[PDB]
Design a protein around this ligand. Structure first.
Ligand SMILES: CCCCCCCCCCCCC/C=C\[C@H](O)[C@H](N)CO
Ligand SMILES: CCCCCCCCCCCCC/C=C\[C@H](O)[C@H](N)CO
Ligand SMILES: *C(=O)CCCCCCCCCCCCC
Ligand SMILES: *C(=O)CCCCCCCCCCCCC
Lengths: 56, 60, 5, 268, 283, 283, 60, 136, 268, 5
């Protein structure tokens, strides 16, 4: 959960130089991002999620 | 017919063990052992036909 | 008798 | 290889058919399992199977669709998309039971000045959501099974309100992968991406996957192919670019049990 | 031979680099995830890793009882327009949502089923009149066996169906069931129909529900108060808890992101916006 | 190899002395305590010492269940301005004082937790109307899991949270918990904050409580009567008892000398005079 | 998997023993053995850098 | 005495000047703008426990007839191997007059106390831009 | 390599920092000497050195400058350009003495339709000429040391004539390499060229070079980085093209002697 | 089988 004591820090992305295109080319584009765990990654203390519910 | 296995001891006060005896004929009646195996993620994380060498260009 | 894992 | 071999250049040959590509991004084997025939230790129907081998395990090309700035996505089901494909389709409708693996090859080329990216997903049991909010599980057989034309995704859920004569079709919303789960997670299914700057095709080798060794191909689809624009098509400054997408698919290691008269389904 | 409670790999110390080895550059088009570890892109120290994945093994992830239904029964005098209430439930994990969502991270599964029954009773009307301790009969009626039409009819004899006679106020009842599927695994998703519509047949005649396979997949639980009725009314509820023991799962899936809307994968208008507002450059 | 139940050292006989050896003279400035025994300053006889320190080992000192909270629930009809009462408690040993004081002889600890639950019920109103035996659900809600807003909402399904369904009048319920701390030991004292106030940030934004680390350290117990309501009202209390098993402790501290005043080390005006009058030269 | 240990017998009526079997996989479920060790107080009572000889002047 | 655990970061962390003990508890009554500082009473060791027992903590005594200094070598102590130094203090140094200063018959004697402290075996993890704390 | 390894594709990792490139022209190690710590046989200050290791030997990125048709060139000094860079700068100003080597990575990408070429030179003792013709050796400390912004070259010598209050800055003329020697000969200094059709970066690994084993980093700069357009920027037919140039530099094997209070220099 | 402490 969001917790200041166990906060993880900051991910950010910047332009190092710039995107350069020639003529006749789109000047705008998308990047897509992906996340995954490394082999040293683990979890514990099983619990119910808040990402589903059943009102009535 | 007693089965003796070791506990992974977390907080401490040699190997500590625990005992299990199955009381029923049907394996469905048994408790879960929790003595489970792990496997490599590859079939989901590297499902490619040609083995990936991570220091190498993925596309060549 | 006994199994030991 | 120092004799030229590349991850990007492949040749696939099945039966009397060959596919070449010069811009691949390797190829995928779903769950690391190559297709196989049904083994005796896992067998279930006892009659001698029919194995059509090269007569059916060959590349069939479906009708080409068109990718534009307004495309939300396309879907197909297997074996349904191949039901009218040569002797595979014949063998399928003559038998009660059938099982099959597939090589799926999605084709889409453009130019170094175009951009865009297609996520190509193979989903086991790709159950899609219906158009009704008064009824559940009511998509008709005919609408569930488009054959080779496939269906499409939409960016908007729009409920069928004609209660007299319900549409009885799917309403598969793209960011919900047409099934109520988020598209960003579809990458846990076996997949490749056709990102036009990188590659012009996707190749997925699919094993037969099911909770049974063999089943009714006519009642049940084992795999779904979902193709969605992860990054939209774009070219130079054209307002209306278009590039084609072609699917060529080959059955692999297919076998059939329970031969009788041919099935003549109600498809419209 | 690697077990679920084994510790994960140690971090190996690693220094500066300047080479043609490019771990950081990759190509997700291939369909693969880049297998990197911190020493591939930063300098690391040696760490002896003690942590394990023991609690996220498939078994440990599912090793909990979950409520799947609540059955209501009463012990009232049957009278010409209303009979004594007994309950009937079609066995399923899809009437509630939490166990369903966990199971649906996967396409197929195999497991032994542990069913635990928690039983609670109360008086519904003001009279100070009492009731004596109730015994409940939980009868499993597999597809094909006669379903009870009355709290006291012949089917409650149970010569072949399994029944539990539960005594009120004792420990919650519990039984185990083997993997009873007619397939080699339970299908959490079935992209198909139970009938082929034939052309030479009417549409009505070839029709069936999308995604349903056997109509009565697993049968019914029928529950009754065995006691004859009291002058005072007592209502009871039987809460059923399901735990999948000795479980195996195949083909992972993205989890349910929008509210369940029936036994299929359908969704309701108005429920389709799970994500909240957050600005791209705001932490 | 010396154990807690081993006998303490024998007194060795010792005679008269006249030397430069000066055991009795020392210097407490060094920070050390002079390790003397009676034979260092008086004449002794030989005694074979049988006494042991067995009952004051850390384990034996803590080997008792202590009440840490009382939770109140009821079984009443929910009505527009007041609902059926279920209880919610943030797990802690600091709501009562006796176990807290014992634990606070030390700065850090590790232990397995044994929780025992004693449950008692009573009628609150005069009517002679009765109630049937109650079942209670004690749900552990770890930080992050949805807290119940109503006695009967979806969270009580518990597909993943551990729950205890306790039957009234049976033996007190009991479960064990491993050492679950996110640190290598539990901190009985944390001299710090969970946030750094930054200058480029508002004071409000960088603010946090002195001495608090994770806001919801261990989560919640939520308790309810599972039964539907009776015409008559029954109130119940769940008394929670905590015993630290398999315990280790570090860095000893002076014990709490003035009354506790909240979860921190704060004290109240008017409570600061623990010591009583006694004259210097009066025995 | 039975563990046999001796009791320290206090009031009397050879070594008397008692038996213990762990019934659960998790060591947290186990009772406390009370088979604990003692240690010297020194880290708290003589925390000085130079070892103290009690017959000697503490300051020299 | 209207709130607990409310000493601000700024007041908790005096930097090198340190803070002081008092012989009297005196509650902050400005509820509009609370002082938000400690009120550490000497015989209660500033924490509600009796000073006479502070000797169970590692200590030395500077008794002027005997010695003119105290030297304490402190290990890193914490419930973690490493932590936020900016959020958390591991050790406190408390200096209290156990027997009061006195000299000849001067009514107002004074002698200085100086602290010199050296870090030992320090290591840092998680390098980024520098922290600029709100200290006033 | 038959497993894909290329002279053009590199990854550099120092501390918590990684640089990747896909269009390199190999990399240079000045005078064939890799950076090293000071050896005991060559040591001089006897006190225990401070070696900040990953805290300072990591990639720092300077302010990006802009290359245009009118650009005459840019220069920086080391260690001066890094004086305010994290713990390297701190370690530098707390000690009398310091020595350090560097990995210098100059970055400049464009497109297959742009053209131009930057000569990137690392010069040991890069003494630059002043603006005065009434006085010599009078460039002030402040003007000699721009910090990370660096300075620039000019195509014209223009003498400071204000004798009342002299500018006291350099006037470094490009074809004279800012020091009275011809630019065409600057290639005897360790260098690379960023020719936009060929590569998008330059990488120079610099040893500590000096007539001493260690020296005052605050008084003395060991290396100068000079970047000059050997062939001017050009693109399609745009009159005013621009592409950015970014410098990322990492100290290597740095050690410091003579610890005291921190130096607070007069920089303006 | 048996441990003996
Ligand atoms: C006296 C009590 C006896 C209770 C006997 C219950 C027997 C029936 C077990 C049912 C198995 C249900 C398994 C869960 C659902 C399926 O996985 C999926 N919906 C697809 O097959
Ligand atoms: C069904 C009942 C399950 C009960 C589960 C309880 C799990 C949580 C255990 C909490 C551990 C509390 C430990 C005591 C307090 C801490 O020592 C200190 N305040 C500092 O960390
Ligand atoms: C293997 O089990 C041989 C040893 C027997 C040990 C005692 C068994 C304890 C009681 C089990 C009763 C049987 C349960 C149906
Ligand atoms: C080691 O334990 C071998 C001897 C077994 C002795 C009988 C065990 C008594 C019953 C224990 C049942 C298992 C508890 C989960």
């Amino acid at each position: 959960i969001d917790d200041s004591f166990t906060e993880g820090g900051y991910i950010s992305v910047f332009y190092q130089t710039r995107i350069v295109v020639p003529l006749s080319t789109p000047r705008e584009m998308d990047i897509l991002g992906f996340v995954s765990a490394c082999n040293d990654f683990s979890v514990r203390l099983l619990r119910d999620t808040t990402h589903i519910e059943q009102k009535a | 017919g007693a089965q003796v296995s070791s506990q992974k001891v977390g907080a401490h006060e040699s190997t500590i063990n625990y005992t299990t005896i199955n009381y029923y004929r049907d394996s469905a009646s048994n408790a879960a052992s929790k003595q489970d195996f792990s496997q490599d993620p590859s079939k989901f994380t590297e499902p490619i036909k040609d083995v990936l060498i991570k220091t190498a260009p993925m596309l060549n | 008798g006994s199994s030991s894992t | 290889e120092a004799c030229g071999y590349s991850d990007r250049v492949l040749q696939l040959t099945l039966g009397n058919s060959t596919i070449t590509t010069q811009e691949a991004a390797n190829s995928v084997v779903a769950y690391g399992r190559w297709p196989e025939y049904l083994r005796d230790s896992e067998a279930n129907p006892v009659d001698q199977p029919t194995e059509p081998d090269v007569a059916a395990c060959r590349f069939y090309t479906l009708d080409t669709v068109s990718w534009t700035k307004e495309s939300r996505g396309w879907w197909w089901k297997l074996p349904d998309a191949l039901r009218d494909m040569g002797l595979f389709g014949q063998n399928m409708y003559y038998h009660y039971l059938g099982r099959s693996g597939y090589t799926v090859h999605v084709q889409c080329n453009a130019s170094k000045f175009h951009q865009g990216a297609l996520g190509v997903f193979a989903v086991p049991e790709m159950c899609l959501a219906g158009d009704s909010n008064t009824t559940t599980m009511h998509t008709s057989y005919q609408n569930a099974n488009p054959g080779e034309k496939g269906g499409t995704f939409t960016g908007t859920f729009t409920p069928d309100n004609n209660q007299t004569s319900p549409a009885r079709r799917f309403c598969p919303v793209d960011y919900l992968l047409g099934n109520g789960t988020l598209l960003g997670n579809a990458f846990v299914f076996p997949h490749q991406i056709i990102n036009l700057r990188t590659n012009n095709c996707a190749t997925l080798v699919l094993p037969y996957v099911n909770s049974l060794s063999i089943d009714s191909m006519v009642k049940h689809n084992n795999w779904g192919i979902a193709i969605l624009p992860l990054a939209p098509l774009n070219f130079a400054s054209e307002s209306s670019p278009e590039i084609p997408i072609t699917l060529t698919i080959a059955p692999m290691c297919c076998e059939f049990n329970g031969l009788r008269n041919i099935t003549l389904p109600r498809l419209q | 031979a690697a077990t679920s409670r084994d510790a994960l790999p140690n971090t190996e110390a690693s220094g500066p680099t300047h080479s043609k080895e490019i771990p950081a550059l990759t190509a997700v088009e291939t369909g693969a995830t880049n297998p990197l570890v911190p020493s591939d892109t930063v300098q690391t120290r040696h760490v002896v890793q003690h942590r394990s994945r023991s609690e996220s093994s498939i078994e440990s992830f599912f090793a909990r009882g979950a409520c799947v239904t609540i059955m209501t029964v009463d012990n009232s005098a049957s009278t010409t327009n209303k009979d004594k209430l007994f309950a009937v439930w079609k066995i399923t994990y899809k009437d509630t949502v939490q166990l369903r969502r966990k199971l649906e991270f996967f396409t197929y599964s195999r497991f032994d089923m542990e069913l635990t029954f928690v039983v609670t009773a109360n008086f519904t009307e003001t009279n100070n009149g009492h009731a004596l301790n109730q015994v409940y009969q939980i009868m499993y009626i597999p597809p094909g066996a006669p379903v009870p039409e009355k709290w006291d009819d012949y089917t409650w004899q149970t010569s072949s169906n399994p029944s539990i006679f539960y005594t009120y106020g004792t420990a919650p009842a519990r039984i185990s069931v083997p993997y009873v599927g007619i397939s080699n695994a339970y299908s959490h998703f079935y992209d198909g129909f139970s009938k082929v519509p034939l052309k030479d047949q009417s549409a009505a005649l070839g029709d069936s529900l999308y995604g349903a396979a056997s109509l009565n997949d697993f049968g019914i639980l029928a529950v009754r108060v065995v006691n004859d009725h009291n002058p005072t009314k007592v209502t009871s509820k039987i809460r059923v808890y399901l735990k999948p023991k000795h479980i195996r799962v195949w083909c992972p899936r993205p989890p349910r992101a929008v509210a369940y809307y029936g036994p299929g994968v359908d969704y309701k208008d108005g429920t389709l916006t799970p994500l909240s507002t957050k600005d791209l450059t705001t932490y």
